[PDB]
Structure formats: C-alpha cells, structure tokens
Amino acid sequence: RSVASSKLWMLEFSAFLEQQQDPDTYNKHLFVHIGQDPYLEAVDIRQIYDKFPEKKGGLKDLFERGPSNAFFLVKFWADLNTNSSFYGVSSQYESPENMIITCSTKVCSFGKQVVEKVETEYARYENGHYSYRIHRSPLCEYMINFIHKLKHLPEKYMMNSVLENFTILQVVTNRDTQETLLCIAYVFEVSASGAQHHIYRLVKE
Amino acid sequence: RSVASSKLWMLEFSAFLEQQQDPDTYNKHLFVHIGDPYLEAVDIRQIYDKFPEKKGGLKDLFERGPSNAFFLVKFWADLNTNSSFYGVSSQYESPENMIITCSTKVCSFGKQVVEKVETEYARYENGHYSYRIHRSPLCEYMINFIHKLKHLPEKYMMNSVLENFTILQVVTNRDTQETLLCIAYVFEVSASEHGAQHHIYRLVK
Ligand SMILES: NC(=O)c1ccc(OC(F)F)c(F)c1-c1c(Cl)c(F)cc2c1C[C@@](CN[C@H]1CC[C@H](O)CC1)(c1ccccc1)O2
Numbered sequence: 337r338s339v340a341s342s343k344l345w346m347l348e349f350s351a352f353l354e355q356q357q358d359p360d361t362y363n364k365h366l367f368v369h370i371g372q373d374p375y376l377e378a379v380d381i382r383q384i385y386d387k388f389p390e391k392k393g394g395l396k397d398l399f400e401r402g403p404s405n406a407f408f409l410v411k412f413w414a415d416l417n418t419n420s421s422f423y424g425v426s427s428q429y430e431s432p433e434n435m436i437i438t439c440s441t442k443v444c445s446f447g448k449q450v451v452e453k454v455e456t457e458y459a460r461y462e463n464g465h466y467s468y469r470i471h472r473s474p475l476c477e478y479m480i481n482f483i484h485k486l487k488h489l490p491e492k493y494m495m496n497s498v499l500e501n502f503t504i505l506q507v508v509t510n511r512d513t514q515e516t517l518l519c520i521a522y523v524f525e526v527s528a529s530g531a532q533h534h535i536y537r538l539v540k541e
Numbered sequence: 542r543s544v545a546s547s548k549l550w551m552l553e554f555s556a557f558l559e560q561q562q563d564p565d566t567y568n569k570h571l572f573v574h575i576g577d578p579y580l581e582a583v584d585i586r587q588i589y590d591k592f593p594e595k596k597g598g599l600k601d602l603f604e605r606g607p608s609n610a611f612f613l614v615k616f617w618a619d620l621n622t623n624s625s626f627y628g629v630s631s632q633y634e635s636p637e638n639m640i641i642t643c644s645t646k647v648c649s650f651g652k653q654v655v656e657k658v659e660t661e662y663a664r665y666e667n668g669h670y671s672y673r674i675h676r677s678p679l680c681e682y683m684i685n686f687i688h689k690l691k692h693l694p695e696k697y698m699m700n701s702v703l704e705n706f707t708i709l710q711v712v713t714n715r716d717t718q719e720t721l722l723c724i725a726y727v728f729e730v731s732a733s734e735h736g737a738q739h740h741i742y743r744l745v746k
C-alpha cells in the first residue's frame with residue numbers, strides 16, 4: 337500500500353517485453369515491477385525539480401496545487417538482461433470511489449517532455465473496491481529504441497550515466513473534477529543484482 | 542464474433558500454465574485458446590448424455606432458452622509443455638450494464654465433479670460493457686487430470702480418456718436469471734505443429 341493517496345492506490349505496475357515463440361508459447365521479461373510498517377522515507381521535491389518539466393502544469397505547479405500527499409518518487413533499478421515481440425506496460429489501481437480517471441505519462445530527457453501518453457480508465461467494482469486496469473498499453477517507439485540503445489553500451493555504469501537524464505512523470509487525475517489523485521516521478525538506474533525499486537514520499541521542507 | 546448471443550459475446554478465452562523462472566522471467570503455455578462468421582449447427586440431443594441432465598441441466602437450460610445463446614466448442618488441446626500457475630482467462634462484452642455469474646461444471650461420464658461459480662461486474666468500454674475473468678485458478682482436479690493425460694504414451698489414448706470429459710459453462714444475468722451464454726466444451730489432444738485448435742458450433746433443436 338505504498339503508492340497511495342487518500343483516493344487512489346497503485347497496487348501493481350510493470351514494464352515488460354513479451355515474445356511469442358509459437359501460437360501457444362510466450363516468454364516474458366520484466367524490466368521494472370511494483371507489487372508482483374508501511375512507512376516511506378521523504379524526499380524534498382526541490383531536489384528533483386530540474387529533471388522534470390517545470391512550466392505551467394509541470395511538477396512544481398502540480399505539487400503546489402496538491403494534495404501533496406498524492407506525490408511520490410520511485411527509484412527503479414531496471415533489469416535489461418533479456419535476449420514476434422511486444423513491449424508493454426501494465427498497471428492496476430484501486431479506490432473506494434467510482435470515478436473516471438485519466439493517466440498522463442510524460443517521458444522526459446534532460447527535464448523536457450519527449451512524449452506523452454494519455455489514457456482514460458473506467459471503474460470495475462471488484463471485491464469491495466473500484467478497480468482500474470491499464471492492461472498491455474504499448475510502449476512508445478521512443479522507449480523501445482531507447483532500450484535498444486542502452487543495451488548496446490558495453491558497461492552498466494555507461495547506461496547509468498545516460499539514465500541520469502531520463503525521467504518519467506505519471507499524473508493520474510479524476511476526469512470529472514480534474515483533481516490530482518496520484519503523481520509519481522520515476523528515476524532510473526540499471527540493476528546489478530533482477531529489477532529493484534525504492535519508493536519515497538515527495539515533500540517540501 | 543462467434544460465441545455470441547444477442548446480450549453477451551465471449552471475445553477471448555484461454556487456459557494456460559505460467560511458470561516463473563525468476564522474479565523477472567516468465568514462460569506461458571496455452572492449452573486451449575479462442576480469440577462470413579457463419580457457424581454450423583449441431584443437434585443438442587447428440588451431446589445430452591455427456592452433460593448433467595437433472596433440473597438445471599443442459600436440456601432444461603436449452604428448453605428455457607434463448608436457444609441462440611447455446612454453443613458447442615470442440616477443443617484440440619496442446620499438452621506439449623515442460624513456481625507454476627494454472628489458470629483460465631476470458632473476456633466478454635455486452636451492450637447492457639449487468640452483474641453476471643459464470644458457472645463452470647467439470648464433468649466426468651456426464652456427472653459433475655467440480656463447479657466454479659464467479660460473479661463479474663461491468664466496466665464501461667467505448668459505448669458498451671466489458672467483463673473479465675482474469676487468471677481464475679484451475680482446480681486441482683484439472684491440474685491432476687492434465688498430469689495423468691501426459692503420462693499416456695500415445696495421443697489416441699488421451700483422446701479415448703477425454704471422450705468422457707466435458708465442461709459446461711453457463712453465464713447468467715444474476716438478477717433476472719437469463720442465460721446469456723451457454724457453452725458445452727469437448728476435448729481431444731492436438732496433433733498439429735500449430736498447437737491448439739478449436740471448432741465452434743451453434744446448438745439447435
Ligand atoms: N537531482 C537528482 O539527480 C536527484 C536528487 C535526489 C534524488 O532522490 C533522493 F533524494 F533519494 C534523486 F533520485 C535524483 C535523481 C533524479 Cl531527479 C534523476 F532524474 C535521475 C537520478 C537521480 C538519482 C539517480 C542517480 N544515478 C546516477 C547514475 C550515474 C552515476 O554516475 C551517478 C548516480 C538514481 C539513483 C538510484 C536509482 C535510480 C536513479 O539518477
């Protein structure tokens with residue numbers, strides 16, 4: 337129950353490469369994953385502002401409009417050890433309320449948006465709550481190409497150096513009221529362990 | 542759009558075995574899968590003795606109707622497969638917002654061995670309503686049955702045993718008790734390089 341505001345909780349997230357060996361055989365590799373004392377440490381949001389878009393509607397504007405307790409930083413250690421392909425993303429959210437949500441994902445390079453994906457999701461009542469599922473949303477070509485470039489680098493420290501300027505900002509809004517339900521800033525390194533993560537609350541002071 | 546009455550369409554169905562090699566590596570094998578669209582008809586009296594036949598049995602269900610919700614699926618299962626999860630997934634669509642119940646009866650010699658009943662709620666999707674059964678666990682009877690079938694040295698022996706194995710799936714509107722879909726499944730083992738196969742028929746008379 338880590339990435340959760342008072343209205344929406346992200347239970348699961350994964351980015352993957354699935355390969356069809358034959359009509360009945362598939363192999364799947366997870367690049368990153370979440371959810372496969374719940375106390376979280378805090379990170380001052382001013383430490384990361386220059387790695388995310390910062391004009392009207394940028395991270396600072398979003399954080400200041402609030403609610404600030406919907407803001408999180410996820411550090412990912414991505415697993416790139418992977419040899420008819422489908423690169424996708426899946427995520428699951430739950431809420432006590434029936435809403436229509438919008439998930440906006442901005443891929444950024446040097447703090448500037450390169451691509452934005454916006455998807456609207458409707459609720460399904462399930463086991464006492466409302467559930468929202470983004471199932472096999474295709475990874476953009478920019479990301480697939482970026483993964484291929486990173487794998488051509490001979491050392492993990494070189495991939496980490498390139499990843500230092502790569503970020504993703506995810507903003508989930510209530511479509512009916514336009515309130516921010518969840519906002520997640522993602523930062524990356526390549527794993528030397530498979531995939532790992534660390535979640536923090538974003539605060540100011 | 543084959544398995545579809547006027548109120549419910551089953552777009553996809555699959556029964557699978559998923560294996561976790563490591564936290565980021567998964568393998569998936571499909572045993573069976575679905576998804577002019579004309580379908581041939583089969584006289585339902587040909588199959589009555591291979592399904593339960595008391596009050597609420599296949600004949601009672603067919604006679605109550607609507608008869609256009611009744612289908613026979615012949616499956617040629619792919620058993621060529623070497624931390625495991627055996628599941629079933631299915632997806633349905635409907636123009637109406639309903640609370641549905643899916644009852645699946647596994648039968649041996651026309652007699653129920655196990656019944657699984659699950660309730661599904663609608664999700665609004667581009668003008669219509671979708672229903673999803675995602676990774677519903679295969680009962681231990683089925684997993685054990687698959688293991689016994691694989692110990693047989695020849696596919697004709699598996700086919701002889703499978704001649705007395707059937708599954709009846711009934712999807713009902715929980716509130717009105719209307720039969721939305723009723724699918725009778727019969728099995729053989731596939732001998733094709735393409736893996737699993739199926740043939741769908743309408744059940745008539
Ligand atoms: N302003 C910042 O840089 C910053 C400040 C505070 C902070 O949180 C902390 F408070 F917890 C941050 F996460 C960042 C941040 C940001 Cl915004 C960024 F976009 C990329 C990025 C980092 C850290 C890092 C350093 N990875 C590099 C790898 C190259 C090596 O040469 C130095 C470290 C990372 C470390 C571990 C796992 C993933 C990523 O890559």
Ligand SMILES: NC(=O)c1ccc(OC(F)F)c(F)c1-c1c(Cl)c(F)cc2c1C[C@@](CN[C@H]1CC[C@H](O)CC1)(c1ccccc1)O2
Pocket residue numbers: 583584587588591615616617700701703704705706707727728729742
């Ligand atoms: N009453 C029946 O037998 C029957 C009548 C009509 C009919 O369909 C027609 F209307 F289209 C049926 F599908 C069945 C039926 C039933 Cl109800 C059953 F429960 C099992 C089963 C079959 C056919 C079969 C025959 N497989 C045997 C394997 C042993 C071999 O020796 C003969 C063929 C099968 C054939 C192909 C693919 C899957 C299964 O296994």
Ligand SMILES: C[C@@H](Sc1cc(Oc2ccc(C(F)(F)F)cc2Cl)ccc1Cl)C(=O)O
Pocket residue numbers: 351352367368414416425441443453473474475476479482483486499502504506522524525526
């Ligand atoms: C943009 C997505 S969202 C997303 C996608 C994610 O994938 C990756 C991010 C970085 C890497 C690499 F380390 F290699 F650089 C690899 C992957 Cl696979 C992770 C987190 C997020 Cl949030 C969408 O929605 O299309």
Ligand SMILES: C[C@@H](Sc1cc(Oc2ccc(C(F)(F)F)cc2Cl)ccc1Cl)C(=O)O
Pocket residue numbers: 556557572573618620629645647657677678679680683686687690703708710726728729730
């Ligand atoms: C019981 C399920 S339903 C179901 C499950 C199905 O799986 C199989 C059926 C037969 C075989 C074998 F040929 F090997 F004998 C193998 C599998 Cl994997 C097929 C159709 C249906 Cl409808 C549930 O919902 O629990």
